[PDB]
Design a protein around this ligand. Structure first.
Ligand SMILES: [Fe+3]
Length: 186
């Protein structure tokens, strides 16, 4: 029974229940993430920005099943083109809007990566991606509005790949948290 999360704490409790097994219902997780009405009072603690790049702020470790984190995008901050290391990846906007560009996995001829599609993810919407759908870049193209998003990755992953849009060449990147449980972690 999927009920509407009344608070962020409620959402986290429901997520723990949804991931209690070894397989998850992607549509149910997306539905409950979308159903949580973003309340900045409840996530302000994690909304730790850096002037020069987006930050990743760990909220909950899902009893080993997932990493739940909040990403803080300054005006003009964007990500690499990247994969998600064979994990489910949910992205819910808590504030602002993000531009998502989808790419095909490159062939190993050093050619330009051509976009497959692009869309604007809007406040409170929850998107989903995995490696079978494609690669993506996420960007806050706003000049005036910081963006804040809530991400769930399952299983948790410690590394991923970033791709060069001009060649399709990839490099492995280690995931590091800007903060954990509201505490800055240099
Ligand atoms: Fe991503």
């Amino acid at each position: 029974e999927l009920l509407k999360p009344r608070t962020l704490a409620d959402l986290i409790r429901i997520l723990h229940e949804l991931f209690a097994g070894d397989e998850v219902n992607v549509e149910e997780v997306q539905a409950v993430l979308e159903a949580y009405e973003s309340n900045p009072a409840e996530w302000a603690l994690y909304a730790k920005f850096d002037q020069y790049r987006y930050t990743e702020n760990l909220v909950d470790q899902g009893n080993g099943k997932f990493n739940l984190m909040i990403l803080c995008w300054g005006e003009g901050h964007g990500s690499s083109i990247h994969d998600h290391t064979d994990s489910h990846c949910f992205l819910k906007l808590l504030q602002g809007n993000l531009k998502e560009t989808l790419f095909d996995w490159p062939d190993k001829k050093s050619n330009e990566m051509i976009k497959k599609s692009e869309r604007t993810l809007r406040e409170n919407q929850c998107a989903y991606i995995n490696d079978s759908i494609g690669l993506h870049r996420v960007e806050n193209v706003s000049h005036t509005e910081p963006a804040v998003s809530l991400h769930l990755y399952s299983p948790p992953f410690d590394t991923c790949h970033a791709f060069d849009q001009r060649t399709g060449h990839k490099n492995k990147v280690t995931m590091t948290f800007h903060s954990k449980f509201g505490i800055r972690t240099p």
